Amino acid sequence: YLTHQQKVLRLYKRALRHLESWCIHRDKYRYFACLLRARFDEHKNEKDMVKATQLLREAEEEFWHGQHPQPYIFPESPGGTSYERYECYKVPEWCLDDWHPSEKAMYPDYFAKREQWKKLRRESWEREVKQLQEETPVGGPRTEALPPARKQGDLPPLWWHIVTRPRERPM
Amino acid sequence: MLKYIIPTIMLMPLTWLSKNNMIWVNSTAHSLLISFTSLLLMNQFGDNSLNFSLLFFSDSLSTPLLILTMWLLPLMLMASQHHLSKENLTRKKLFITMLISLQLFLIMTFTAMELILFYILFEATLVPTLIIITRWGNQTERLNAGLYFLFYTLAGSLPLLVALIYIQNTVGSLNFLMLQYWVQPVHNSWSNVFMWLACMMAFMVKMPLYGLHLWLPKAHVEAPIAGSMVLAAVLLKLGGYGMLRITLILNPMTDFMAYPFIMLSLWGMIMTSSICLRQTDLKSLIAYSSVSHMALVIVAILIQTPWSYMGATALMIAHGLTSSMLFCLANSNYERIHSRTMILARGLQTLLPLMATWWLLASLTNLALPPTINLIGELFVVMSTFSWSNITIILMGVNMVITALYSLYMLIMTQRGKYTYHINNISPSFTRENALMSLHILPLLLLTLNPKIILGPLY
Amino acid sequence: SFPKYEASRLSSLPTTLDPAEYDISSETRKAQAERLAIRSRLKREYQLQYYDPSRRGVIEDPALVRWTYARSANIYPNFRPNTKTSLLGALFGIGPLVFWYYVFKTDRDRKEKLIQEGKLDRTFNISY
Amino acid sequence: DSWDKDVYPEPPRRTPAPSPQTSLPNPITYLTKAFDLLVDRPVTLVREFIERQHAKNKYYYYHREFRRVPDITECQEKDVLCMFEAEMQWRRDYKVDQEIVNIIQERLKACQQREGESHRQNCAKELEQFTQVVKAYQDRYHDLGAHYSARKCLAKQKQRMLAERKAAKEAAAA
Amino acid sequence: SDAPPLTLEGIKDRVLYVLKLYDKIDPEKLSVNSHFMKDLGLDSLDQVEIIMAMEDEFGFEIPDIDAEKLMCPQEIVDYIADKKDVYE
Amino acid sequence: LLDLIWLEAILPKTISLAQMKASTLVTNQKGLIKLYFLSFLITILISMILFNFHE
Amino acid sequence: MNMFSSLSLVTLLLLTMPIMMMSFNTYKPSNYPLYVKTAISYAFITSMIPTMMFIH
Amino acid sequence: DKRFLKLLRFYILLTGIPVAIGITLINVFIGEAELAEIPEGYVPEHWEYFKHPISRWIARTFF
Amino acid sequence: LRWQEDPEPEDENLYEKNPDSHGYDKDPAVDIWNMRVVFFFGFSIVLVLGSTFVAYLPDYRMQEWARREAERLVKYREAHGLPIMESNCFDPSKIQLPE
Ligand SMILES: [Zn+2]
């Protein structure tokens, strides 16, 4: 979940982004950008949590009433005009295992070095499993954060599919 | 028909006497020569049909069905090579024998001149089909599927046996040629109402008709690949062939007895097409699409117009090659991911480029994209049903909209999108699979150039 | 001033306007922390197979199998012929069939009557 | 030459002569010459070469003729041998009449395109011949059903003759 | 897409260039490791505006889960490098 | 509602259920000679009193 | 008419030529985008000859 | 995928080209027949009521 | 355990032992010959030659004859002033109405 601090910062980022859409021009955005900041300062250091949550609750409703119906969205952000555009070009690395030997003859250096990564992953798997069994509580993990490599020569647990992922512009 | 019956029988000695490593090659090579020689049945005349002997005759209706029937035996043997690779030698040869037997009973059924002979062979197809479903299925539901496929057919078939024998005692013969000249109008009475039901219920359980179709989503889904192909390609068309023949001696009673079945079929298209939009199993989606397509055949046959009979014949041939193609495509995924759920493997166009072209072509023919013979057959039925009643255009039109939805929903869900990350055994497509699909679509697209050879006797 | 938001089955209540989010008590904290435990526990079981270098196949998901089973094979054994099902099963199954029968019977009777009287135009109708 | 003119009539052509009233050259006139030299002439040479080979190995094919046999009206009930030949003859005549409706329809479709904006008045004769042949075809072949036969066509004719005969009785009633 | 590829030095220069143009940051003590909270006397509201100026610089959003976890210009440089496949 | 519940419950299931019930009655027999032969007597009487098979 | 008819069909058949050559692979890649453009460009001039005959 | 398309192309053209070449020659150096009235007292065979040579060959040999 | 049963045999990948596999069989010799029979009879014979045979069928169901016959009758009918098509298919000189 989100503490009271986070729920206020997130409301602050959204308000400026939707405020930017209404203003369009850069000079006019700066004007109301400062006024919006001021309203967040005069209550910056309120002490009563109940009043603090009251202000946040009554600010969201104002935000909802005044939100732009069609806010600006970055091209590659969720809902943008370029979101997931290149998911059709992202092929996983295991697809190269099935290449015909004739094809691999055209990339000897690449497939001479690809085998080194495969050997590295294969040798380091057994240790990674141990690093998690001993460092995890009796029942099971209570969070999704993995532990780093606590020794030299050992790679972080669960690194293959976060390191070898397809590039954001595969082609 | 001895030039086709006897060679089919010789496929049995060939399979058993061949080497251990050449059963699939000898069976597939000679099953393609029998298919090649089946084109000689195309010697049809505008006035008269071919009447080889007292037993067997072939006309413009049975000829295309024979050619399709003799063209699936090679394809069924190609599709079955993989999932029977680690199988005992003798059981593989018994499996091939069952398919050969099924063809033999099928090329004698479509040519039997005497209706009771047509009945014996029409029923003989249950035995090999039942054994294929129950012995070489993969799931637990294959045993419960055979009973449904067996007792639904027999429930309506036995009443047909009594009705046929009654007709011979009255008329004096069952030879189909004689019944063209000795047929008499059916007087309207409670006795003739039940002779109409008995003479037509056996065939309407095999189409299948909506309401009586519960056996099909089980048998097609739970059968092996070869069983599904013949079940949906040639065995659903025994009902169509029978009705096109038995309706000769049921006039004029068919003019008012057809109402309950037309409404079931017209309203069954929409119910079954809608069911496809919410199917989690990919092989079950294809099965429910056969019930929706075969409901147009039922309406075309029951209204008895020259256009409808032409449309029904084309639809049966077109649906035979399209349903079979879809079953093979789905099985290709099954042999890799070992599951039938449609949402398990996605984004297969980025992993199997050329296999996504077959999916597109199969889907386009399914939704009747012109000028494919699917559209020609489906179009002729709508033209005839419009003259029957202008209001049927609403129901036919809505079924076209829903048909495109599930045809493309199947394509988008499985081929497009993002691939499943954890599935890393999707190997490149084999030459067997690519050739297997190419022997479905190519004949299906070549028939558009000369459609008259699949348009039936009324052409 | 600010009209109240009225949700629907096609327009869910925004999380920022949800009263249940602001009322944070100890019991919810343990619940929210407990849900993250199952989610984190499930993730590790999936990850110990996803990252396995010798694994080549499909990681069977029991959650998916239960979904398909509940939709196909678990319907009838958990069905009872009560009033809600019998009425729904009648007006959805038999209702439409009866409605369409009279729509076609009435239309064909009217058309047949005209043709006998010769007052239905079929001047160029030779295709049927 | 390749088709009898009587069955497929063609009104005489009337091509207006060019009457230029400008100095600018007509591009079509140059293209017409450039097309004849580059396209028409080389095509003709090939056709002449092929047609010479045909004349060396000429052979003929004939048009089958069917002599008349007794129709269904002369056949005893339940006599398969006599009905069979009477039925086959009827089916051969059904096809011929279908092509007649095509030939007349082709005339009506050719006239409309040929006459341009004046088709409404200049194709009156073609339209009338189409409205009569269609009526004749409809009477003898409409509503028989998918299982049409000589017996049902005869059954339809006799019913109509009864209505026509019964029309006289109530028509010559005064 | 015909655009020039990014570089670690190029990313770092642009990250600092924006900070040098923030009034509440004195350029004299601005360094690639200057903590925004503990080494520059800035609060979270200002830190949010920093991210809102970085994403408008490179034209890609930073989710609020990760935006509120970067507390130094070098970290922002690493974040962009990870999300753009910049390696040398 | 239709394909998985009612169409199954108005033909396959109900017909199948009746045959299961009819099989239990015919087969659930105590095996006693005294009670099988007492049934022969009832058949002979009914055949003569009701159905008059003896004339 | 010998020209109006011929040039009217060649316009349609010309557009289908790149499709046919890309099925039997009787061509070369890396120039196909420039191959399709030329076919459309040449199809435009051939279609004006029938159009001029209509205006005249 | 490329290999399969090469095989499909090869085998279709393996007998496709001779058929195209064969059909072209038959239409050039043999050609079709000419419709003529039946000579009096002459009974044509069943394969002399067809125009194209290949149609006549099919009727004579198989049908 | 409840019985002695073999473990599930992991699916065999046909490309590991033969990257040139056509997918028909594990034996390279049999596999190549299986592809040639299917591709030759399937495509080079049944389809290519089957299409040619169908293309040149001898006047399927006498449709070219019917058109040719109708030309003769229309020429005769209009030349002699008779109706192009009659509304009675059978000569009424040989019909006896019920009463
Ligand atoms: Zn498998």
Side-chain angles (χ1 to χ4, degrees):
Chain A
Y1 75 131
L2 280 51
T3 57
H4 186 282
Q5 168 179 359
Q6 296 177 301
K7 296 176 66 169
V8 177
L9 298 180
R10 284 165 158 78
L11 167 60
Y12 179 61
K13 187 178 178 179
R14 262 193 277 101
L16 283 171
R17 278 281 169 258
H18 282 251
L19 178 62
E20 197 282 342
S21 308
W22 281 109
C23 302
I24 302 174
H25 304 265
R26 308 302 304 117
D27 71 324
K28 180 158 86 171
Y29 170 65
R30 293 261 61 95
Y31 181 86
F32 297 102
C34 292
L35 302 188
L36 178 53
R37 172 56 181 268
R39 298 179 59 183
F40 277 91
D41 278 0
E42 72 182 27
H43 307 134
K44 182 192 299 302
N45 50 267
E46 202 80 11
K47 292 261 61 59
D48 190 4
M49 299 303 301
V50 177
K51 298 176 90 301
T53 294
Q54 184 66 3
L55 293 185
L56 181 61
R57 177 174 175 84
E58 299 184 9
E60 294 291 344
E61 292 182 351
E62 180 172 347
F63 165 76
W64 192 264
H65 179 87
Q67 67 175 345
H68 194 262
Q70 185 184 355
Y72 176 95
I73 310 181
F74 279 101
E76 279 179 330
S77 292
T81 61
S82 295
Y83 186 59
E84 292 180 12
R85 170 175 296 182
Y86 299 101
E87 303 299 340
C88 62
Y89 299 117
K90 312 245 284 285
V91 183
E93 59 80 19
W94 61 259
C95 279
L96 296 175
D97 286 0
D98 289 314
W99 277 28
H100 191 248
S102 185
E103 295 185 82
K104 295 173 179 179
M106 293 171 58
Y107 299 94
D109 302 341
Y110 185 94
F111 282 93
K113 176 156 55 272
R114 173 181 161 78
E115 180 61 15
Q116 293 180 349
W117 282 95
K118 298 173 66 60
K119 188 185 93 298
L120 181 63
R121 183 202 183 183
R122 181 167 49 263
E123 293 177 355
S124 64
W125 171 243
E126 45 267 19
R127 171 54 192 169
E128 292 173 28
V129 183
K130 252 298 300 182
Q131 203 274 1
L132 292 167
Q133 296 170 347
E134 69 190 22
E135 294 193 358
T136 187
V138 178
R142 304 283 293 184
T143 172
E144 298 186 21
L146 296 309
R150 303 287 172 76
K151 172 163 58 276
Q152 188 64 12
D154 287 2
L155 312 173
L158 312 183
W159 59 275
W160 182 254
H161 292 303
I162 55 180
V163 170
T164 55
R165 63 183 183 276
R167 297 183 279 105
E168 294 295 353
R169 294 295 196 272
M171 317 181 186
Chain B
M1 284 289 307
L2 286 172
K3 58 171 72 68
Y4 308 106
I5 285 166
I6 296 170
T8 303
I9 290 171
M10 304 309 296
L11 285 171
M12 283 169 185
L14 173 66
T15 290
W16 286 84
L17 293 180
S18 293
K19 284 185 68 179
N20 288 9
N21 61 323
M22 300 261 72
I23 64 178
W24 295 115
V25 175
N26 300 10
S27 61
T28 297
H30 286 275
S31 58
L32 284 157
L33 293 178
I34 295 168
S35 182
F36 181 49
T37 61
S38 68
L39 306 175
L40 304 181
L41 292 169
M42 219 88 71
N43 175 26
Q44 301 292 328
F45 310 95
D47 54 5
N48 189 27
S49 64
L50 286 78
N51 306 317
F52 311 110
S53 57
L54 293 153
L55 289 175
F56 297 121
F57 90 117
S58 179
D59 66 333
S60 297
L61 177 53
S62 61
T63 300
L65 283 164
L66 284 167
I67 300 170
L68 179 67
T69 301
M70 272 178 279
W71 174 251
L72 283 176
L73 182 60
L75 278 46
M76 285 189 291
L77 295 164
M78 301 176 196
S80 291
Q81 298 193 16
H82 182 77
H83 91 82
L84 294 183
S85 56
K86 299 161 59 176
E87 182 68 4
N88 183 14
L89 178 65
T90 309
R91 260 125 66 179
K92 295 163 68 183
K93 291 148 82 173
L94 286 174
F95 178 89
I96 300 166
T97 307
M98 291 297 98
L99 299 180
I100 298 165
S101 294
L102 189 56
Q103 166 170 325
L104 181 64
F105 300 150
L106 281 172
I107 63 181
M108 295 190 288
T109 299
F110 295 123
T111 60
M113 192 190 294
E114 199 271 358
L115 288 177
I116 271 286
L117 175 53
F118 161 82
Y119 179 89
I120 293 173
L121 303 162
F122 170 88
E123 228 65 18
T125 71
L126 280 52
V127 178
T129 304
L130 170 80
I131 299 164
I132 288 171
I133 295 175
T134 54
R135 175 56 174 191
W136 287 284
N138 278 273
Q139 309 295 0
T140 311
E141 289 70 0
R142 67 178 196 260
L143 292 180
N144 193 80
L147 299 170
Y148 270 62
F149 167 82
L150 179 62
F151 288 92
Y152 263 81
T153 304
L154 289 176
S157 297
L158 289 170
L160 174 71
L161 180 63
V162 183
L164 291 177
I165 291 167
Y166 169 87
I167 292 160
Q168 190 192 244
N169 296 326
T170 62
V171 172
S173 181
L174 279 175
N175 195 280
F176 187 75
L177 292 186
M178 294 290 297
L179 289 174
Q180 304 190 29
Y181 307 131
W182 290 22
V183 59
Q184 300 291 335
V186 180
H187 171 70
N188 181 16
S189 67
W190 285 119
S191 298
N192 287 323
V193 158
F194 286 89
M195 194 192 75
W196 193 98
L197 288 166
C199 286
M200 292 287 291
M201 226 63 183
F203 303 136
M204 278 188 190
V205 173
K206 221 166 183 178
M207 284 262 54
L209 176 77
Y210 181 64
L212 298 168
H213 72 277
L214 285 178
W215 67 266
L216 187 155
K218 293 178 170 58
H220 292 202
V221 173
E222 299 299 346
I225 177 53
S228 300
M229 287 172 64
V230 68
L231 270 163
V234 176
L235 284 179
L236 292 184
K237 317 303 161 44
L238 295 178
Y241 178 88
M243 293 199 299
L244 292 167
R245 289 276 194 263
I246 201 72
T247 42
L248 169 64
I249 77 188
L250 302 184
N251 296 319
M253 183 162 291
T254 303
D255 64 355
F256 67 83
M257 284 299 304
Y259 278 96
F261 303 98
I262 290 171
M263 264 54 84
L264 280 170
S265 297
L266 283 177
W267 185 244
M269 297 181 307
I270 301 170
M271 289 297 95
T272 51
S273 292
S274 293
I275 286 169
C276 288
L277 295 176
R278 299 293 304 277
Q279 276 296 326
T280 70
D281 189 328
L282 177 51
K283 204 176 181 188
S284 183
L285 190 155
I286 301 167
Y288 274 99
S289 185
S290 295
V291 187
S292 172
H293 284 311
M294 294 287 97
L296 291 74
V297 173
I298 295 179
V299 167
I301 295 169
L302 291 173
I303 64 177
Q304 294 190 148
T305 64
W307 270 67
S308 67
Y309 271 44
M310 282 182 291
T313 303
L315 244 174
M316 291 191 302
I317 302 302
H319 170 274
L321 291 168
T322 303
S323 58
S324 182
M325 190 181 184
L326 292 177
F327 280 119
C328 291
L329 283 165
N331 181 259
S332 163
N333 292 341
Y334 177 78
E335 281 180 350
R336 285 170 174 74
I337 74 185
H338 293 139
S339 186
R340 258 136 53 175
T341 313
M342 201 196 315
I343 203 175
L344 181 59
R346 306 172 302 276
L348 291 172
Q349 181 170 6
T350 72
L351 306 169
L352 306 172
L354 180 54
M355 185 57 63
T357 286
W358 306 129
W359 273 98
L360 183 64
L361 294 176
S363 307
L364 291 184
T365 61
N366 180 271
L367 58 73
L369 190 74
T372 57
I373 56 171
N374 302 61
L375 184 278
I376 296 170
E378 178 179 0
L379 186 63
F380 286 9
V381 175
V382 171
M383 302 300 99
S384 47
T385 53
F386 183 87
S387 183
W388 188 80
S389 176
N390 289 24
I391 304 178
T392 59
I393 199 71
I394 296 171
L395 294 166
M396 302 295 292
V398 167
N399 179 60
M400 280 171 54
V401 179
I402 305 178
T403 298
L405 286 175
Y406 79 75
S407 296
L408 297 175
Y409 166 57
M410 177 180 60
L411 182 60
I412 292 171
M413 173 60 70
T414 64
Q415 302 306 268
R416 298 163 177 256
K418 275 217 73 174
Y419 59 86
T420 302
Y421 283 137
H422 65 87
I423 298 173
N424 58 31
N425 68 327
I426 303 298
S427 54
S429 305
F430 294 101
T431 305
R432 178 179 53 84
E433 296 162 356
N434 282 315
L436 179 53
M437 317 313 173
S438 299
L439 297 164
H440 280 101
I441 193 67
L442 287 179
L444 175 58
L445 298 174
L446 288 170
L447 287 173
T448 294
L449 307 175
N450 211 343
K452 64 172 180 291
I453 62 171
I454 65 173
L455 281 180
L458 276 293
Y459 166 90
Chain C
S1 292
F2 305 156
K4 178 62 182 300
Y5 183 89
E6 44 179 6
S8 175
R9 55 161 51 94
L10 302 177
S11 295
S12 61
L13 191 61
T15 187
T16 58
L17 305 194
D18 190 58
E21 292 292 356
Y22 302 110
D23 294 328
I24 297 300
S25 59
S26 181
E27 59 90 358
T28 68
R29 194 77 60 79
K30 190 176 70 176
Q32 297 179 355
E34 188 174 0
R35 293 169 192 159
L36 177 57
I38 296 169
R39 180 164 79 169
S40 300
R41 181 179 56 83
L42 285 169
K43 190 83 71 169
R44 184 62 58 86
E45 182 181 338
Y46 170 64
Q47 280 183 342
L48 286 180
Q49 304 186 76
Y50 180 24
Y51 290 79
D52 190 330
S54 66
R55 185 197 62 85
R56 185 180 184 269
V58 185
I59 304 177
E60 181 176 351
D61 184 5
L64 186 64
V65 176
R66 288 194 283 272
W67 181 65
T68 64
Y69 192 94
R71 291 280 294 277
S72 57
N74 192 39
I75 300 284
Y76 190 78
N78 308 283
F79 142 83
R80 307 186 315 277
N82 57 18
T83 304
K84 203 258 280 292
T85 55
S86 59
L87 291 171
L88 288 180
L91 94 174
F92 294 156
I94 302 165
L97 298 181
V98 176
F99 166 79
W100 285 116
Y101 170 72
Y102 286 114
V103 171
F104 294 118
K105 235 298 181 62
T106 300
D107 182 56
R108 294 195 88 260
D109 292 326
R110 186 190 59 82
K111 191 194 299 185
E112 180 66 11
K113 204 180 70 173
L114 296 175
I115 290 177
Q116 299 172 352
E117 297 181 359
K119 54 169 54 53
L120 199 170
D121 176 58
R122 285 148 75 253
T123 307
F124 311 100
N125 201 18
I126 40 170
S127 291
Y128 68 117
Chain D
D1 185 6
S2 296
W3 68 92
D4 171 73
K5 276 64 173 61
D6 300 332
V7 289
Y8 301 109
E10 181 68 3
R13 193 63 167 276
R14 283 147 55 92
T15 305
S19 68
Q21 294 186 6
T22 185
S23 301
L24 300 178
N26 173 264
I28 291 167
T29 300
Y30 285 74
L31 297 179
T32 303
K33 263 182 285 295
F35 183 85
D36 299 329
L37 176 59
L38 274 296
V39 181
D40 180 66
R41 279 298 307 267
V43 169
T44 311
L45 309 191
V46 168
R47 184 63 182 169
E48 293 168 355
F49 171 81
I50 289 174
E51 179 57 24
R52 279 198 291 274
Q53 306 296 351
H54 296 170
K56 295 169 61 174
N57 188 2
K58 183 186 296 302
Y59 66 116
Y60 315 94
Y61 83 98
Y62 315 93
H63 168 69
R64 183 179 286 278
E65 296 188 352
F66 296 111
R67 87 174 64 108
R68 240 65 230 289
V69 313
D71 57 337
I72 191 63
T73 53
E74 308 176 31
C75 289
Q76 298 177 351
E77 281 187 336
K78 299 183 68 175
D79 186 357
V80 300
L81 291 179
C82 300
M83 271 189 295
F84 165 72
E85 307 208 50
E87 238 299 340
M88 296 298 96
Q89 179 192 274
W90 183 87
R91 282 171 179 271
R92 287 189 299 267
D93 291 1
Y94 194 177
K95 273 182 171 56
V96 175
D97 283 58
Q98 286 176 348
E99 307 295 355
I100 282 172
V101 182
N102 290 332
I103 285 178
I104 275 49
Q105 266 179 137
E106 289 184 56
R107 289 184 187 177
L108 186 63
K109 271 143 63 173
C111 186
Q112 191 275 353
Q113 176 61 11
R114 182 191 300 117
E115 266 48 18
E117 293 287 349
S118 57
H119 65 279
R120 204 73 171 270
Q121 176 179 10
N122 287 30
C123 299
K125 294 184 176 59
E126 266 74 356
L127 180 62
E128 239 303 336
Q129 204 172 17
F130 163 82
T131 300
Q132 288 169 2
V133 67
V134 167
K135 170 61 71 62
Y137 182 93
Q138 190 182 36
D139 285 355
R140 55 161 69 183
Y141 294 134
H142 198 53
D143 290 357
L144 297 182
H147 299 283
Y148 53 62
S149 58
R151 289 173 47 187
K152 296 185 184 179
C153 180
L154 173 54
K156 192 197 187 190
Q157 175 178 349
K158 294 166 67 167
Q159 172 175 316
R160 197 183 63 260
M161 294 192 298
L162 283 176
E164 297 180 357
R165 180 238 271 169
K166 173 166 174 295
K169 289 208 302 302
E170 281 62 7
Chain E
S1 180
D2 191 66
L6 299 182
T7 307
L8 292 173
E9 297 297 344
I11 296 167
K12 187 174 68 175
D13 288 331
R14 299 176 63 185
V15 168
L16 302 172
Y17 195 103
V18 177
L19 292 176
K20 255 86 80 65
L21 292 175
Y22 192 22
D23 290 351
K24 294 189 181 183
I25 282 177
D26 193 358
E28 275 53 78
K29 75 191 302 304
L30 175 49
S31 57
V32 299
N33 305 337
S34 66
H35 204 283
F36 298 108
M37 309 295 293
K38 299 198 298 298
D39 297 359
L40 296 171
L42 300 169
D43 59 326
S44 48
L45 268 60
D46 297 335
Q47 180 268 346
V48 165
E49 300 186 8
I50 292 298
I51 297 301
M52 287 187 57
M54 299 300 165
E55 61 191 25
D56 294 338
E57 182 66 15
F58 302 87
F60 81 98
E61 174 175 336
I62 303 177
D64 305 3
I65 188 63
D66 300 329
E68 64 96 15
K69 199 170 292 305
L70 306 165
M71 309 258 59
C72 148
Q74 174 60 7
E75 299 179 346
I76 290 171
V77 171
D78 299 332
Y79 195 83
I80 297 174
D82 171 59
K83 192 148 272 61
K84 306 281 281 183
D85 297 326
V86 178
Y87 58 107
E88 56 84 8
Chain F
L1 195 61
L2 276 56
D3 263 62
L4 271 49
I5 286 302
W6 276 121
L7 288 177
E8 287 278 13
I10 68 179
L11 267 172
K13 301 292 185 177
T14 44
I15 285 174
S16 303
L17 184 60
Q19 309 313 324
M20 187 193 302
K21 268 66 188 63
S23 185
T24 53
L25 302 190
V26 60
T27 58
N28 282 16
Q29 242 65 73
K30 67 285 105 59
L32 276 38
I33 296 171
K34 176 171 72 177
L35 304 175
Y36 291 152
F37 280 83
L38 179 62
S39 175
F40 298 179
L41 182 56
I42 297 173
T43 307
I44 294 172
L45 292 176
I46 292 170
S47 301
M48 300 171 58
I49 303 302
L50 273 68
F51 303 131
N52 297 273
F53 292 143
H54 71 285
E55 52 177 348
Chain G
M1 178 260 291
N2 55 260
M3 186 180 64
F4 190 100
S5 302
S6 300
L7 278 298
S8 67
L9 300 190
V10 74
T11 291
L12 310 177
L13 180 61
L14 202 172
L15 294 178
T16 67
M17 213 82 68
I19 301 294
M20 298 191 303
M21 303 304 178
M22 198 174 190
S23 290
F24 284 135
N25 290 25
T26 61
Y27 79 111
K28 54 174 63 57
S30 181
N31 307 265
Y32 192 67
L34 180 54
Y35 178 25
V36 178
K37 185 192 79 69
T38 309
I40 275 63
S41 301
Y42 268 77
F44 170 67
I45 58 177
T46 58
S47 65
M48 290 299 293
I49 287 77
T51 298
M52 283 191 293
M53 295 186 65
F54 173 82
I55 300 298
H56 168 46
Chain H
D1 290 331
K2 293 174 62 57
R3 180 176 66 161
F4 161 79
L5 295 171
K6 275 201 293 295
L7 294 171
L8 174 62
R9 200 176 307 102
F10 174 83
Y11 283 100
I12 284 176
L13 294 172
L14 181 67
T15 54
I17 288 169
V19 174
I21 284 171
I23 291 169
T24 301
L25 297 178
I26 296 171
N27 292 337
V28 169
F29 294 102
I30 307 188
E32 297 176 334
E34 298 293 351
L35 192 289
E37 297 295 348
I38 301 174
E40 304 299 343
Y42 183 70
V43 183
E45 292 184 8
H46 68 284
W47 52 261
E48 296 185 8
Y49 303 83
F50 302 116
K51 179 180 282 290
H52 199 268
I54 294 173
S55 300
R56 296 162 60 98
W57 178 78
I58 288 173
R60 178 171 63 263
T61 306
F62 305 113
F63 289 4
Chain I
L1 306 104
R2 265 269 50 169
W3 58 1
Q4 303 298 129
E5 186 72 319
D6 291 3
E8 172 66 9
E10 72 295 351
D11 187 62
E12 177 272 351
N13 182 13
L14 222 70
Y15 282 134
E16 295 288 342
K17 295 177 65 177
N18 188 10
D20 287 66
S21 178
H22 289 292
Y24 286 103
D25 191 73
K26 302 178 296 305
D27 184 4
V30 176
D31 186 4
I32 294 171
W33 277 112
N34 210 146
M35 179 275 294
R36 301 214 186 100
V37 301
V38 173
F39 273 75
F40 181 77
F41 296 100
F43 293 110
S44 301
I45 301 301
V46 174
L47 291 179
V48 175
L49 302 179
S51 301
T52 298
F53 181 94
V54 163
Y56 296 109
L57 286 171
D59 187 14
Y60 189 77
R61 299 200 78 204
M62 59 165 59
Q63 190 178 63
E64 298 185 14
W65 178 92
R67 167 57 66 98
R68 209 151 45 195
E69 179 70 18
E71 292 168 0
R72 299 212 314 99
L73 295 183
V74 170
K75 159 173 285 298
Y76 186 95
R77 244 87 120 175
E78 283 174 352
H80 297 6
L82 316 171
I84 192 66
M85 183 180 298
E86 288 289 356
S87 179
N88 293 332
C89 189
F90 306 104
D91 198 68
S93 73
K94 42 179 87 294
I95 295 175
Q96 307 180 21
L97 285 172
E99 60 179 18

